[PDB]
């Protein structure tokens, strides 16, 4: 910084002086809240990162010349660093015949997962005949390994694999984010790893558990010490970039070892195809993410969500130094929680990323952006912004105060919480399956009991404060005064709305991000009472009965109301008659 | 000049499981630190399901340096190893239970603010800043029951030790620098004092500093009242229990089991919970499902009761004599949760 | 300049954007050397100050195609079987010109010829497939290229080119001496001469006549700020028609004729080797072959494309088992039913396929086929001129 140079023509001279600039990161809220299922903009304006004049540029994680990254973070991750400065080496060679990059599979069995890794190594005419060694640093906020090596294109060179020490950690460093996924109400895995700049053609990583040292490496034939090295997760891919789900082989072999964690010393194994060459720089990313709850999961301790989120901002113009991205978020509910497709939907890296919020953040676990900053003054001082992102108190609402038979009925609920996605109509939609606790009712099949009630039930509706549901399964064989059942007893009186499920009955977005469900159906003039709710299927009466004179009512389960905590809804009306 | 300021000038006494002590089996606390549900729902000895979770202190600390503010519009951290101290002192004796300011090391809590390495004693880990230009910093540390000066009036729990260090073992060496005396145990009485010392590097004068806040651990007694003393069958009755023993975390708002409150009447006599006679539960409709907190720091609890038609297949009748009933295991009376009991009452009719 | 000079980029809509491997058209139409019987002197046209060579058409009407050199190779690199997906032929040196062609092209970075190479020498015979990362153009062509050549028309970026005027009297073919004029089968007609353009810069097409010049700007960038898709109605009734429409500048890489894509847009197909994927011609305009399916996926971020080259599909957004959206065949494309067993039937998406393409276009992965509305209008759509879009509503749908 300050120094310059001096180029002339015309006997007039120039000078080009070098110089840093501040940077500003502020994030913009749209309108007063940020709230779930909106995209607002992440704007950076830092002119040490407007490298060409004449082009407009990005914040890729992968090129190693794009030296600061913004980053997210929320609970603990487990990132490459997490263990100190890793240690990695190249190599080329061959699989051996019982390495688990040969052997192995991803089909959730031991058998496919879990092996041992040996290789067979031939850096003879390599350069000074050793592996390829790196220098190795790490991003404080962008958590990405930077590997500096002597450049080499040549037909000769060529490399294989890639053998990472993470520092000091162990299975105790592991398990304080990976979870059970046996021992745990709600648990998901993800692994999430970025290895473009090598520009392979296939990778396969598997995690490398030892009681011994990750490097120098050694083969099963040497030291017959350990039953199993290694766990694959991911083989033989396509994808140099991936965010994948984990299977439960994976949880079930990482708390499957009888050695204790301390001495168990971990590490990362790659296997490549098609990498010719290696720049002066290379950069690696690898994450364990975890998601779920403990318990009940309504106290706030036993509620956990691990993740790191990284914003590739794009240039806006070809000499505007300011750089432009989006964020978003999904606040978890009742129905999307038990699914790992949720949590898998996200987007890690990207220049709009999106993350998982478990519960209302607000004051100092409010959402916040980091960029590492090189400063006019020429010392590295970060600069950050944060959003508070609340949850919502739910109301559901009924329009009419009476109605009469063959009236339609309309329900609308006004949760902004629900709102998962800011491009699509979010639809909710009634379970039909006779072997769940939620049937006839607005939720998921996949459910669970809990303190609070059934983890699978998001709305349902009543006739006389008893569940509104059509007589199916095996306990409706009662027949009631008369020899008929209520099921044939209720087709007789030509009642197809037997109960919600059966009039197509759905929670439907009114915009793309409203926040606002209506749903509708018909009164029918018979329904079949459930004797005991108790048992599953329901006991169903044996006589259907008149709705006239009866109080119709809607229920509603907030996961989360403005504290972030489960509380129930609803709203009541009467049937009447002429 | 640094300030450190503490979350509450007032505490509740935490309390443990069952699963904590290794005495035999008993349908009563027996002096043992749990606090158990209304004993018409006890069934035979007391079992995981007939107790209120493991109920743990959760405070937080906050130092107002702008010494540590290097960074006017960034996130910035307490970097100063071992500033930081936060002891349990009853009377002379003191037990330290860690430090912050330093990356966190699994180690054991200190007896007496005396051991020679500081390396052997737990680190909770660096503070972080609570907004980019506040310039404060915030901790949050987990108190047990079991964390205090050793005592005689503990010896009644036989107490299983949860293992600071990387072993597995309940003993008092796993958790403590220093054994305790025979015929005592370490533990959380009432009237202990809670202090936090910040060890300023650099004060107004440039140099090294040392300011304090502290608060006392205290039992109250329970207070259960409702909207109106006359209810309609099949109304909506608020029923309001204010335990302060109960505002374990400010940040949050607790849950408690409904199973605490007894109801008894001529129709049948239950705990209006998942513990209550067959179809209780769906007999009274809650609102929430169970008690909850009226905001982050209130100690109030609210519930939604439908006055039930028939309990157990008995119907009620009019003018009815109702008695609500609640069990504070650990009132002003008594010195730690267990221990003594107080049952305060609620009277209400149908109309 | 819309008085006597044309360029296909000139777009009010699109604010005279290009991008991409897409070929430019220039037409000169002037009264003063519309003559085919006479030697008019050939119209002087330049783009970025460098000359465009021009050949006369029977219309009367003089004609000049161009492209950005990298694209132009990168692209023809996706193009493994020749005269399918984006073919420009062969790539040669500017100074082939004379040798192949018959005329000077040494104002250019290079010309795409459509032969086929016999005989792959190092040096004399020029490059069939082109190179996946771009650059020079070194290797050179020669009149003994051409004779040896086993396929001529291995162009398949330019498909609809007017017939070079012929030989008599004075006149040479096209006016300028192309040695062989039979347009869209022969080896010289048409060809696209490649310039080296700059990303964010204005492209300058300059004409000069006496009494003055007229000239048309262009900006070479990536366009995803133009690009859109929409659909016919809010609410679909059951057995509906979805008329999808897509307006993107990108997708027109023929100036002359009407340009066909084809999808794969099943996403949740979770098999391992499968991949969505975007398409080049599988289909005509008039639902024939019109050529084999050649991979794009890995190449579109060296093509310029910025989130927008891409067509994905959900049939059952909630997983409710009954599929809301189903395909159906139509005028421009050719779907069969492959599983043809009793046990299914038409509402099952994942039963159709591609019969001639079954190793990415096979069952499940669901093909989806749009068609340009006009040579050179950049409007895409699924319905055909029927009005029988490719898209349809299941007739149990909830």
């Given amino acids: 910084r300050g120094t310059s140079a001096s180029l002339d023509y015309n006997e007039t001279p120039q000078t080009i002086l070098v110089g840093f600039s501040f940077a500003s990161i502020d994030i913009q809220p749209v309108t007063d809240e940020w709230t779930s299922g909106q995209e607002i903009p992440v704007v950076i304006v830092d002119a040490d990162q407007n490298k060409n004049s004449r082009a407009d540029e990005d914040l890729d994680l992968n090129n190693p010349d794009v030296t600061l990254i913004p980053a997210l973070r929320t609970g603990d991750p487990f990132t490459i660093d997490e263990g100190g400065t890793p240690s990695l080496i190249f190599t080329n060679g061959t699989n051996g015949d019982d390495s688990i990059f040969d052997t192995g599979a991803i089909n959730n069995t031991s058998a496919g997962q879990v092996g041992n890794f040996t290789l067979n190594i031939n850096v003879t005419r390599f350069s000074s005949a050793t592996n390829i060694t790196s220098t190795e640093s790490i991003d404080t906020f962008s958590k990405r390994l930077i590997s500096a090596q002597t450049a080499n294109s040549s037909a000769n060179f060529d490399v294989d694999f890639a053998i990472i020490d993470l520092g000091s950690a162990t299975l105790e460093t592991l398990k304080e984010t990976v979870v059970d996924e046996d021992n745990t109400a709600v648990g998901f895995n993800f692994f999430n790893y970025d290895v473009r700049s090598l520009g392979a053609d296939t990778v396969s990583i598997a995690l490398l558990n030892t009681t011994g040292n990750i490097l120098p490496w050694v083969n099963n034939d040497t030291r017959n010490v350990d039953k199993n090295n290694a766990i694959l997760l991911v083989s033989n891919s396509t994808n140099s970039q991936a965010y994948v789900d984990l299977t439960n082989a994976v949880s079930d072999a990482v708390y499957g070892s009888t050695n204790t964690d301390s001495n168990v010393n971990i590490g990362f194994a790659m296997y490549f195809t098609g990498v010719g060459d290696l720049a002066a720089k290379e950069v690696i990313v690898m994450d364990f993410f975890s998601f779920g709850f403990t318990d009940d999961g309504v106290q706030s301790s036993e509620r956990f969500a691990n993740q790191i989120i990284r914003i590739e901002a794009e240039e806006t113009g070809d000499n505007t130094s300011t750089f432009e991205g989006s964020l978003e978020y999904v606040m978890v509910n009742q129905i999307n929680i038990q699914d790992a497709g949720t949590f898998s939907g996200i987007t890690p890296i990207a220049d709009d990323p999106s993350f998982i919020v478990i519960e209302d953040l607000t004051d100092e676990d409010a959402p916040r952006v980091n960029y590492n900053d090189l400063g006019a003054d020429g010392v590295t001082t970060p600069v950050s912004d944060q959003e508070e992102a609340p949850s919502h108190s739910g109301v559901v609402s009924l329009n009419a105060d009476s109605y009469k038979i063959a009236d339609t009925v309309v329900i609308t609920v006004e949760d902004l919480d629900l709102n998962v996605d800011s491009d699509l109509i979010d ?149 009447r008659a002429n | 000049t640094g300030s450190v300021s503490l979350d509450r000038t007032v505490y509740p006494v935490p309390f443990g499981t069952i699963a904590d002590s290794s005495k035999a089996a008993n349908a009563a606390p027996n002096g043992r630190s749990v606090f158990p549900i209304h004993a018409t729902g006890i069934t035979s000895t007391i079992d995981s399901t007939e107790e209120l979770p493991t109920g743990d202190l959760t405070i937080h600390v906050r130092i107002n340096d702008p ?22 002192i009853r009377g002379s004796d003191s037990v330290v239970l860690g430090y912050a300011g330093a990356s966190e090391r699994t180690g054991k809590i200190d007896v007496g603010g005396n051991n020679g390495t500081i390396s052997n004693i737990r680190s909770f880990g660096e503070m972080d800043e609570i907004a980019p230009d506040a310039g404060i910093f915030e901790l949050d540390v987990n108190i047990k029951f079991t964390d205090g000066p050793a005592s005689a009036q503990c010896n009644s729990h036989d107490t299983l030790y949860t293992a600071l260090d990387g072993t597995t073992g309940k003993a008092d060496t796993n958790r403590f620098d220093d054994g305790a005396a025979s015929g005592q145990e370490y533990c959380i009485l009432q009237g202990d004092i809670l202090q936090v010392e910040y060890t300023d590097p650099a004060d107004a004068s440039g140099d090294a500093n040392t300011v304090t806040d502290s608060a006392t651990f205290d039992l109250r007694n329970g207070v259960l009242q409702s909207d109106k003393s006359v209810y309609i069958i099949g109304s909506d009755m608020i029923l309001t229990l204010i335990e302060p023993d109960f505002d374990l975390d400010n940040d949050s708002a607790e849950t408690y089991d409904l199973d605490l409150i007894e109801w008894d009447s001529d129709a049948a006599t239950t705990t209006m919970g998942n513990k209550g006679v067959t179809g209780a539960a769906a007999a009274f409709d809650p609102e929430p499902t169970d008690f909850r907190e009226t905001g982050d720091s209130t100690g109030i609890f609210q519930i939604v009761i439908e006055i039930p038609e028939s309990l157990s297949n008995d119907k009620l009748e009019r003018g009815e004599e109702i008695i609500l009933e609640y069990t504070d295991w650990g009132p002003s009376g008594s010195d730690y949760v267990g221990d003594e009991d107080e049952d305060v009452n609620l009277t209400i009719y149908t109309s | 300049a819309n008085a006597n000079l044309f360029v296909s980029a000139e777009n009010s809509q699109f604010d005279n954007y290009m991008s991409g491997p897409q070929v430019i058209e220039v037409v000169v139409i002037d009264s003063d050397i519309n003559d085919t019987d006479e030697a008019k002197g050939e119209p002087d046209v330049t783009v970025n100050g460098k000359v465009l060579r021009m050949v006369q058409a029977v219309d009367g009407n003089w004609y000049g195609y161009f492209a950005d050199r990298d694209q132009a190779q990168i692209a023809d690199s996706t193009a493994t079987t020749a005269d399918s997906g984006l073919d420009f032929g062969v790539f040669c040196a500017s100074s082939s010109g004379t040798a192949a062609l018959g005329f ?12 086929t190479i016999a005989n792959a020498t190092a040096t004399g015979n020029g490059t069939q497939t082109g190179s996946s990362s771009g650059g020079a153009i070194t290797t050179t062509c020669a009149a003994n290229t051409l004779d040896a050549s086993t396929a001529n028309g291995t162009i398949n970026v330019v498909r609809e080119a007017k017939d070079p005027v012929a030989a008599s009297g004075s006149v040479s073919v096209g006016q300028i001496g192309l040695k062989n004029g039979t347009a869209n089968s022969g080896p010289n007609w ?120 891409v067509l994905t599909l959900d049939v059952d957004a909630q997983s409710s088992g009954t599929p809301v959206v189903t395909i159906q065949d139509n005028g421009d494309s050719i779907l069969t039913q492959l599983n043809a067993s009793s046990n299914t039937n038409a509402n099952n998406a994942s039963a159709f396929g591609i019969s001639t393409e079954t190793a990415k276009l096979g069952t499940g992965s669901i093909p989806v086929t749009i068609t340009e509305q006009g040579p050179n209008s950049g409007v895409f759509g699924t319905y055909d001129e029927s009005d029988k879009s490719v898209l349809k509503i299941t007739d149990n749908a909830k």
Avoid at chain 1, 495 to 511: C, K, Q, S
């Fill in chain 3, 104 to 115: 000077s092209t040494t104002e250019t970075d290079g010309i795409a010829i459509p032969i």
């Fill in chain 3, 190 to 309: 048409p060809f696209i001469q490649l310039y080296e353009l700059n990303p964010t810069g204005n492209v300058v097409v300059q004409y000069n006549k006496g009494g003055g010049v007229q000239s048309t700007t262009l900006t070479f960038d990536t366009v995803d700020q133009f690009a859109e898709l929409s659909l016919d109605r809010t609410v679909f009734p059951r057995v509906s028609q979805v008329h999808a429409t897509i307006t993107d500048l990108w997708l027109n890489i023929d100036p002359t004729d009407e340009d066909s894509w084809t999808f794969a847009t099943n996403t949740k197909n979770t098999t391992s080797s499968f991949n969505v994927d975007t398409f080049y011609q599988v289909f005509d305009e008039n639902g024939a072959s019109g050529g084999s399916a050649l991979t794009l996926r890995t190449t579109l971020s060296s093509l310029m494309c910025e989130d927008n080259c």
């Fill in chain 2, 67 to 88: 010494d540590f503010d290097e960074n006017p519009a960034g996130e910035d951290a307490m970097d100063q190893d071992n500033a930081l101290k936060i002891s349990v």
């Fill in chain 1, 427 to 575: 639809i909710f939609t009634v379970v039909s399956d006779n072997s769940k606790a939620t049937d006839d009712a607005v939720g998921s099949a996949t459910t669970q009991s809990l303190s609070f009630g059934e983890l699978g039930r998001l709305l349902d509706v009543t006739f006389d404060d008893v569940i509104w549901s059509t007589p199916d399964g095996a306990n409706n064989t009662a027949t009631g005064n008369d020899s008929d059942t209520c099921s044939t007893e209720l087709s007789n009186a030509g009642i197809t709305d037997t109960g919600l499920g059966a009039t197509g009955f759905t929670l439907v977005e009114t915009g793309a991000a409203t926040g606002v469900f209506v749903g509708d159906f018909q009164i029918p003039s018979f329904w079949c009472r459930v004797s005991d709710t108790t048992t599953t299927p329901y006991t169903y009466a044996g006589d259907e009965e008149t709705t006239t004179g009866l109080d119709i009512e809607v229920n509603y389960v907030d996961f989360r109301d403005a504290s972030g905590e489960i509380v129930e809804v609803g709203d009541s009306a009467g049937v």
